[PDB]
Amino acid sequence: GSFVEMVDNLRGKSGQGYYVEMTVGSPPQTLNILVDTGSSNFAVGAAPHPFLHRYYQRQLSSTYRDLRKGVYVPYTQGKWEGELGTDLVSIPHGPNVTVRANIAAITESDKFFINGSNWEGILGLAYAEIARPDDSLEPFFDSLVKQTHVPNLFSLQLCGAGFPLNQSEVLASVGGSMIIGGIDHSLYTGSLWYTPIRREWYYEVIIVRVEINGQDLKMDCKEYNYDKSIVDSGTTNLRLPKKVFEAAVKSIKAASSTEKFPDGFWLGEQLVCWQAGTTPWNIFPVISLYLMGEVTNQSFRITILPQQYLRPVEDVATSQDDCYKFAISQSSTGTVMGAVIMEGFYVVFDRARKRIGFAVSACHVHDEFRTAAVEGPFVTLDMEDCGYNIPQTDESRSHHHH
Numbered sequence: 066g067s068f069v070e071m072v073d074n075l076r077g078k079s080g081q082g083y084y085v086e087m088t089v090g091s092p093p094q095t096l097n098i099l100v101d102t103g104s105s106n107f108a109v110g111a112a113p114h115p116f117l118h119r120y121y122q123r124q125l126s127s128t129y130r131d132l133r134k135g136v137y138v139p140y141t142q143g144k145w146e147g148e149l150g151t152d153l154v155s156i157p158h159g160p161n162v163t164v165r166a167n168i169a170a171i172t173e174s175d176k177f178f179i180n181g182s183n184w185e186g187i188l189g190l191a192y193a194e195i196a197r198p199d200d201s202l203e204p205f206f207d208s209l210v211k212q213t214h215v216p217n218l219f220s221l222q223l224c225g226a227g228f229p230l231n232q233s234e235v236l237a238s239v240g241g242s243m244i245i246g247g248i249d250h251s252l253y254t255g256s257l258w259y260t261p262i263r264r265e266w267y268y269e270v271i272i273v274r275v276e277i278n279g280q281d282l283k284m285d286c287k288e289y290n291y292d293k294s295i296v297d298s299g300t301t302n303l304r305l306p307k308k309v310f311e312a313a314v315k316s317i318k319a320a321s322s323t324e325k326f327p328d329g330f331w332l333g334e335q336l337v338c339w340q341a342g343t344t345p346w347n348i349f350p351v352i353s354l355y356l357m358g359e360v361t362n363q364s365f366r367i368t369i370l371p372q373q374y375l376r377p378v379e380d381v382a383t384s385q386d387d388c389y390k391f392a393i394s395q396s397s398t399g400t401v402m403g404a405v406i407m408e409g410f411y412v413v414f415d416r417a418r419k420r421i422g423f424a425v426s427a428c429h430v431h432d433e434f435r436t437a438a439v440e441g442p443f444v445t446l447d448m449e450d451c452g453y454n455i456p457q458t459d460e461s462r463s464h465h466h467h
C-alpha cells in the first residue's frame with residue numbers, strides 16, 4: 066500500500082482543475098493534462114491558442130497514426146473539436162509503462178481552455194459509454210489496463226487551498242496525488258468506506274440522505290439523485306438538483322443568519338469578506354451526504370466543512386481581508402460531487418469491483434473544532450430505492466450494442 070513515486074503528482078490553480086504531467090508521442094512531448102472523472106476522452110490542444118504556450122505536434126511524433134476521422138464535442142459552455150488518432154502515451158510520475166492510446170488532437174475550441182490554468186489537455190477517466198464520437202472509442206484508462214498489468218483502479222487525493230494566501234494577483238496553487246493501479250495508505254486516515262458504482266458511464270453513485278448541521282432535509286431520497294449523482298474531479302462545486310439546492314441554501318442561510326449576505330453571494334456571483342483570520346467558521350453548518358453502502362440497508366456518511374464549500378479568493382483591493390465564494394450551486398443534470406466534496410477525502414475509483422471508496426484525507430483543510438469525516442455504518446430497515454430512472458429516448462433505445 067505504497068506508491069511513493071506517484072504521490073504529489075497533481076498540480077493546479079484553485080477552481081481551474083487538477084492536472085497530471087503526461088507524455089505523448091516519440092520522442093515524448095510533455096503536456097499538463099486535466100484529471101477529469103466526468104468525461105471519457107483523451108483530448109489535447111494540437112494547434113496554437115491564446116491560452117497555450119505548448120501543444121501536441123503530431124508531425125514531431127514518429128509513432129503517431131491518424132485515424133482519419135474527426136470528433137466534435139459540444140457542451141453547455143462551448144465546444145472542442147479535432148482529429149482522432151493514436152500515439153504512445155505515458156505518465157512520467159505514474160506507472161512505469163507506455164501504452165498506445167486514442168488521442169483527440171484539438172484543432173478548434175470555444176470556452177474550453179482556461180487562461181492561467183496551466184493545462185493543455187484533458188484526461189477523461191470515466192467509461193466508454195460517454196466517450197465521443199461513440200463508445201467504440203476506447204478511453205485511456207481502458208487501454209492502460211488492457212495493455213499492461215496495471216490493476217483496474219485509481220485513487221485521487223485532491224488537496225485544497227486556504228488562508229493566508231501567498232499571492233494577491235494570481236489564484237492559489239493546489240496539489241494532490243493520482244495513484245494509478247492502487248491505494249496509498251499514507252494519503253488517508255481512519256476507515257475506507259465503499260459505495261457501489263450504480264452504472265458504468267459517469268461514476269454514478271446513490272445518495273440516500275442529506276443533513277445540514279445534523280438536520281435531515283427530509284426529502285424523497287430520489288430527489289437527491291435526480292436525474293443522477295456523480296463523482297466529478299472536473300467540476301469545482303458541489304452541485305445539487307434545484308429542489309435540493311433550495312432546501313440546502315435555506316438551511317445554511319438559517320444557520321449563518323447573524324450575517325446578512327447579498328443574493329449574489331448565495332448565487333456564487335459575489336465574494337464575502339472578513340478581516341484576516343476572523344472568519345466566523347462556526348456559524349456555517351457541516352453538510353453530510355449519506356451514500357448507499359455495499360450492504361443492503363447500510364449507508365455511510367461523508368461530512369464536509371464550510372472550509373470546503375467556501376472557496377478562498379484573494380482580492381487585489383481587499384488584500385487585508387479573507388474573502389470567499391459560495392461553492393454550492395444549482396444543477397438541472399443531477400448531483401455533482403465536485404472538488405468541494407473530493408477535497409475532504411481520499412477517493413478510490415475501484416473499477417475492478419464496481420465501487421467508489423471514501424476516507425478522510427491526510428491533507429483536508431480543517432480547524433480545531435470540526436473535521437471532515439467518513440462515518441458508518443448507518444442501518445435503515447427496509448431501505449427504499451433512491452435511484453432515478455432516466456426516461457428512455459427512442460434514439461437511445463435504437464442503439465445496438467455489439
Ligand SMILES: CN1C(=O)[C@]2(CC(C)(C)Oc3ccc(Br)cc32)N=C1N
Pocket residue numbers: 081082099101102103104138140177187297298299300
Ligand atoms: C463538468 N465538466 C465539464 O464541463 C468538462 C467537459 C469537457 C471535458 C468537454 O470540457 C471541459 C473542459 C474544462 C473543464 Br475544467 C471541464 C470540462 N468536464 C467536466 N467534468
Ligand code: NI
Pocket residue numbers: 086157158
Ligand atoms: Ni515531471
Ligand code: NI
Pocket residue numbers: 465466467
Ligand atoms: Ni445490430
